């Protein structure tokens, strides 16, 4: 029907404030109401055609705080609103949406590497705490598939993970699943058809440009065609059958490169730049 | 006796190694030997007509490291020398000198918010740990007065302080003192004719331009006339009965504005610019 990519916040040597929109029907960008406090390394999602930005961290030379903020944006009124904040602050969080609920997983606070999980019921503006995961994970990708939630990669605070776990909402329990082929902390995670894609991230020595997917039928991680640029902590989303990756860090420079992946051709192609180079940005589509 | 203001390092885009001298006898700047290793959020002080630069943090894209460095500078050879390093790294340290000895207080190291305190005897090139403070403080100003030490403002890692404590060297113990009117983390702190000045810093919502002083006889904090620019993490010193504030961050730009305060008139007035905008800089006079 025709929709917009939203990219909210980011980090370009400090926490950014920009809420920006992209339209690939005309390859143009939009500027929208900025964030009512700069956050970096949060996560975005859309619930009931409203956009939510969760957690993250405000980094500035003027000190640096972790955020338990949950702030909804309305593209119909171009206004942010604060919503009930989470139980704890989560920097380098991941989120998933199930059944019109917001699941927030892991991420940092102070030195404490979280492993807890909480559900926000939008209809009641309430955080309700759920079953913690089997590993502590910060900088963790999350995908929702078949009404299940997939926590992938991440960092436990002592070494960089290559593990994955699966949460059964109906049962409220966690299980480990097939570990990945490569260590990946702060990679980009999402669903395409019946596969869990995981692009980029950090391993401990280098930035990554390799991608792999997971098929729940075949319980296996298969390597796919790499991205043109190596990138850690990047935005990622899907629209009309393609993966769009926004920004990230290449071990030197913060990218403005947005790359697109057509699964039909299994080829990557740069589709735009962004208005400024940035990392740690949370992303969504409506 | 001819006397110079020194500014050692700072932070603009990365940690600088600039050692620079202002001369208010001729409103001129002098360029001197660079810092061995680029540091920011350090502290300067002069002991026996030698300058010491203490702690801080090297920030760059390559990584960010904290420093436990003590490096002495000698204007008579224009040479740095590494001196015995402290026990732990302290970023956003404060230092005080008592009886020709160097007190290093609080400051950060990774997530660890220090509240230890250590004395360096230059006569032996020796660090000795002393009685820790009652709160953990990073980005804390220090004032030496009546052969006591006043740790003021700062950040404990959960909330921005507006509190202060007083260390009795002869007794080796701490006591709280009357809190300030305004929350201040990384303000400028100094002694001038009794009074304990605290200009600028961060509170948690805004950069500050308000100044307040303390009289040890009267144990009260009274507000004085504000600065022209709002500034956090700035250099501060005295020369011939005036407060000079170097640089800082205004929420947007790193300032090059150096402002002077005449206590006789209780008014602020810009006295120069600096050769580059910067924050987190440590300062001394000799």
Method: X-ray
Closest chain A residue by Cα to residue B234: A62
Closest chain B residue by Cα to residue A37: B205
Mutate to test the interface with B, among A60, A63, A113 (most CBs of B within 10 A): A63
DSSP for B99-167 reads SS-EEEE--EETTEE---EEEEETTTTEEEEEPPPSS--BS-EEEEETTEEEEES-B-SSSB---EEEE
Instruction: Give the B-side interface with A, CB within 8 Å.
Output: 11, 13, 61, 110-112, 139, 155, 157, 160, 185-186, 202, 204, 207, 232-233, 249, 251, 254, 279-280
DSSP for chain B reads ----EEEE--BSSSB---EEEEETTTTEEEEEPPPSS--BS-EEEEETTEEEEE--EEEETTEEEE---EEEEETTTTEEEEE---SS--BT-EEEESSS-EEEE--EETTEE---EEEEETTTTEEEEEPPPSS--BS-EEEEETTEEEEES-B-SSSB---EEEEETTTTEEEEEPPPSS--BS-EEEEETTEEEEE--B-SSSB---EEEEETTTTEEEEEPPPSS--BS-EEEEETTEEEEE--B-SSSB---EEEEETTTTEEEEEE--SS--BS-EEEE-
Tokens coding A249: 């860090």
Q: Three-class SS of residue A15?
A: strand
> For chain B, how many residues are written?
286
Residues of A in contact with B61 (CB under 8 A): 252
Tokens coding A42: 């949060």
Phi, psi of A155 (to 5 degrees): -135, 135
Selecting from A61, A63, A110 the residue whose C-beta is nearest the C-beta of B185 gives A63
**How distant is the Cα of A50 from the closest Cα of chain B, in angstroms?**
27
Selecting from A60, A61, A110 the residue whose C-beta is nearest the C-beta of B111 gives A110
Q: What is the resolution of this structure in A?
A: 3.0
Closest chain B residue by Cα to residue A206: B62
**Neighbour-count burial for B86-98, b at 16+ CB within 10 Å, e otherwise:** bebbbbbbbbbbe
**Who's near A120: CB < 8 A, 6+ residues apart?**
A70, A83, A84, A86, A101, A102, A104, A126, A127, A128
**First-to-last CA distance in chain B?**
9
**How distant is the Cα of B141 from the closest Cα of chain A, in angstroms?**
15
Q: Are B263 and B213 in contact (CB under 8 A)?
A: no
Selecting from A13, A62, A111 the residue whose C-beta is nearest the C-beta of B233 gives A62
Q: Are B119 and B133 in contact (CB under 8 A)?
A: no
Mutate to test the interface with B, among A15, A59, A62 (most CBs of B within 10 A): A62
Sheet holding B282-285, edge to edge: B28-32, B19-23, B5-8, B282-285
Q: Are A29 and A264 in contact (CB under 8 A)?
A: no
Selecting from B13, B111, B280 the residue whose C-beta is nearest the C-beta of A111 gives B111
Closest chain B residue by Cα to residue A110: B111
**Who's near A140: CB < 8 A, 6+ residues apart?**
A92, A93, A94, A105, A106, A107, A151, A152, A153, A154, A161, A185
Pairing relationship of beta strands B220-224 and B19-23 according to DSSP bridges: unpaired
Structurally, chain B folds into a number of domains equal to 1
Rounded Cα–Cα distance for residues B117 and B123 (Å): 19
Closest chain A residue by Cα to residue B15: A61
How many alpha carbons fall within 13 Å on the CB side of residue A70?
23
CATH number at residue B89: 2.120.10.80
Residues of B in contact with A110 (CB under 8 A): 111, 157
Rounded Cα–Cα distance for residues B87 and B190 (Å): 26
Selecting from B11, B110, B155 the residue whose C-beta is nearest the C-beta of A61 gives B11
Is the CB of A62 less than 8 angstroms away from the CB of B249?
yes
Query: Which domain covers residue B127, as residue numbers?
Result: 5-285
Nearest alpha-carbon partner for A110 in B108, B32, B22, B127: B108
Selecting from A13, A63, A110 the residue whose C-beta is nearest the C-beta of B202 gives A63
Q: Are A200 and A230 in contact (CB under 8 A)?
A: yes
Sheet holding B235-239, edge to edge: B235-239, B242-246, B258-262, B267-272
Instruction: Give the A-side interface with B, CB within 8 Å.
Output: 13, 60-63, 65, 110-111, 252
Nearest alpha-carbon partner for A251 in B20, B12, B61: B61
Residues of A in contact with B186 (CB under 8 A): 62-63
Q: Other CB atoms closer than 10 Å to residue B124's CB: what's the count?
A: 9
**How distant is the Cα of A10 from the closest Cα of chain B, in angstroms?**
16
A176 φψ region: left (φ > 0), alpha (ψ -120 to 50), beta (else): beta
Is the CB of A61 less than 8 angstroms away from the CB of B157?
no
Is the CB of A61 less than 8 angstroms away from the CB of B110?
no
Tokens coding B278: 């910067």
Closest chain B residue by Cα to residue A60: B251
Nearest alpha-carbon partner for B51 in B27, B78, B28, B25: B78
């Amino acid at each position: 029907v025709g929709r917009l990519i939203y990219t909210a916040g980011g980090y370009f040597r400090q926490s950014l404030s920009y809420l920006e929109a992209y339209n690939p029907s005309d390859g143009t960008w939009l500027r929208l109401a900025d964030l009512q406090v700069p956050r970096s390394g949060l996560a975005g999602c859309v619930v009931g055609g409203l956009l939510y930005a969760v957690g993250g961290r405000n980094n500035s030379p003027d000190g640096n705080t972790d955020s338990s903020a949950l702030d909804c944006y309305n593209p119909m009124t171009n206004q942010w609103s604060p919503c009930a904040p989470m139980s704890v602050p989560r920097n380098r969080i991941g989120v998933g949406v199930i059944d019109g609920h917001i699941y927030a997983v892991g991420g940092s606070h102070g030195c404490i590497h979280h492993n807890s999980v909480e559900r926000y019921e939008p209809e009641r503006d309430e955080w309700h705490l759920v079953a913690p995961m089997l590993t502590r994970r910060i900088g963790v990708g999350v995908a929702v598939l078949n009404r299940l939630l997939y926590a992938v990669g991440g960092f436990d605070g002592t070494n960089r993970l290559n593990s994955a776990e699966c949460y059964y909402p109906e049962r409220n329990e966690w299980r480990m699943i097939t570990a990945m082929n490569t260590i990946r902390s702060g990679a980009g995670v999402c669903v395409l058809h019946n596969c869990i894609y995981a692009a980029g991230g950090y391993d401990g020595q280098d930035q990554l440009n390799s991608v792999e997917r997971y098929d729940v039928e075949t319980e296996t991680w298969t390597f796919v065609a790499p991205m043109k640029h190596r990138r850690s902590a990047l935005g990622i989303t899907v629209h009309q059958g393609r993966i769009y990756v926004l920004g990230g860090y290449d071990g030197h420079t913060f990218l403005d490169s947005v790359e697109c992946y057509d699964p039909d051709t299994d080829t990557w192609s740069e589709v735009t730049r962004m208005t400024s180079g940035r990392s740690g940005v949370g992303v969504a589509v409506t």
